Amino acid sequence: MKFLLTTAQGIEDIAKREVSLLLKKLGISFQIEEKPLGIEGRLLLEAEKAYYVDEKGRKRELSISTYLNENSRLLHRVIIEIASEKFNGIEKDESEEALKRIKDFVSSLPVEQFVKVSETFAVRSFRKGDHNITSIDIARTVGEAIFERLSRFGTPLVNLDHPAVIFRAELIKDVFFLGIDTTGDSSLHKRPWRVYDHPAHLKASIANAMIELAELDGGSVLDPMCGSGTILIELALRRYSGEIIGIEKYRKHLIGAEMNALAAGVLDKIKFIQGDATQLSQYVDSVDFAISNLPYGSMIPDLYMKFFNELAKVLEKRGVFITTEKKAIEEAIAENGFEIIHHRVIGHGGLMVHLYVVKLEHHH
Numbered sequence: 001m002k003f004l005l006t007t008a009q010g011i012e013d014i015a016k017r018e019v020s021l022l023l024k025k026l027g028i029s030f031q032i033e034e035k036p037l038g039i040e041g042r043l044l045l046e047a048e049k050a051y052y053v054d055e056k057g058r059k060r061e062l063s064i065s066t067y068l069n070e071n072s073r074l075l076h077r078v079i080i081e082i083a084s085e086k087f088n089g090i091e092k093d094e095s096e097e098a099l100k101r102i103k104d105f106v107s108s109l110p111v112e113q114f115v116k117v118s119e120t121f122a123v124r125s126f127r128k129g130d131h132n133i134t135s136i137d138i139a140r141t142v143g144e145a146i147f148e149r150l151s152r153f154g155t156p157l158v159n160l161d162h163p164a165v166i167f168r169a170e171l172i173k174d175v176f177f178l179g180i181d182t183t184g185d186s187s188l189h190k191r192p193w194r195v196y197d198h199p200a201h202l203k204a205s206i207a208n209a210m211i212e213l214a215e216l217d218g219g220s221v222l223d224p225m226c227g228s229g230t231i232l233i234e235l236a237l238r239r240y241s242g243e244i245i246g247i248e249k250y251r252k253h254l255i256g257a258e259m260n261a262l263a264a265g266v267l268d269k270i271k272f273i274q275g276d277a278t279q280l281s282q283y284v285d286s287v288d289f290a291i292s293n294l295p296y297g298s299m300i301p302d303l304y305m306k307f308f309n310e311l312a313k314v315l316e317k318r319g320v321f322i323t324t325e326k327k328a329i330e331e332a333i334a335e336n337g338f339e340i341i342h343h344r345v346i347g348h349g350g351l352m353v354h355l356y357v358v359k360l361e362h363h364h
């Protein structure tokens with residue numbers, strides 16, 4: 001079976017690693033390709049089917065997609081792949097021609113093998129790039145092609161709202177994909193604990209990426225500009241053994257973080273402090289790790305300069321930070337005795353953000 005596994009652009013490798021460890025626990029053979037056909041935010045998983053012997057002494061199949069939906073913290077969607085292909089030049093094609101290519105391609109796929117045509121279906125589409133067609137166009141054409149093909153085998157019923165089966169069709173640049181979305185209408189990053197919605201909140205998948213990149217070892221973890229508490233809540237939900245501390249400047253957001261942490265059942269796991277990170281050394285003397293989604297915003301250069309001056313007084317091991325302001329953070333890091341030991345770019349809410357892992361230059 002082939003699966004398309006989606007995640008944030010720029011963390012594909014971290015997601016592959018998580019999925020690999022999860023599947024290794026099942027005992028199955030598998031291969032994972034990062035960025036199939038060049039497309040960011042995707043993995044292509046090729047796995048053996050997961051068989052066991054059930055209470056009747058019969059071979060029975062375990063659902064790989066349910067296992068991954070239930071256990072992954074880095075993935076957005078788990079989609080059973082029907083087909084992925086390059087439609088070379090489709091960005092330039094006129095509307096009529098582009099849709100024709102898509103309809104003809106889909107008409108050729110054995111979709112009747114991925115739905116009991118008693119079941120209701122709908123088509124969800126996603127489009128990204130410069131096309132002469134829209135999401136709506138794609139969903140209609142694909143929807144038409146699948147209804148027509150299914151009608152060759154039975155009587156198919158659409159249900160747009162509560163389909164039993166969602167076919168997801170995505171066109172990103174030159175690349176077309178069709179699959180069965182096992183995840184459903186809410187992506188895996190939607191957390192039911194998020195009762196307070198901070199307007200610059202970090203998606204949970206990227207929070208977990210930052211945690212993985214810190215390489216935590218049970219030492220104390222501070223988010224000194226914590227907002228609604230996402231990073232610390234995801235960490236407590238990992239049953240982290242170590243101390244967890246959040247500091248946030250504005251009351252409203254700090255109370256939002258408390259409410260989110262209560263909703264998640266981990267309020268007892270986190271110390272939440274209202275405070276100023278440019279004064280960090282007043283609130284703590286020593287922390288092992290700092291992990292923060294910094295404000296993206298002048299005033300930024302000076303906020304970062306003072307914060308990294310204070311962080312230098314208290315940090316023992318590593319910091320992991322995300323920001324849009326590459327130049328401000330890079331200067332604050334260099335002026336304050338820090339060294340960058342990893343950098344990458346991540347796609348977050350249609351922004352390119354920069355992630356850095358840092359340590360103090362003098363620590364060996």
Ligand SMILES: C[S@@+](CC[C@H](N)C(=O)[O-])C[C@H]1O[C@@H](n2cnc3c(N)ncnc32)[C@H](O)[C@@H]1O
Pocket residue numbers: 198200201202203224225226227228229230231247248249250253275276277278292293294295296303
């Ligand atoms: C991008 S948001 C954090 C969002 C958090 N990752 C979440 O998911 O909710 C940056 C936060 O830094 C806080 N902040 C700004 N200046 C601060 C300062 N001097 N001290 C502490 N927090 C500050 C803001 O109030 C804001 O909540």
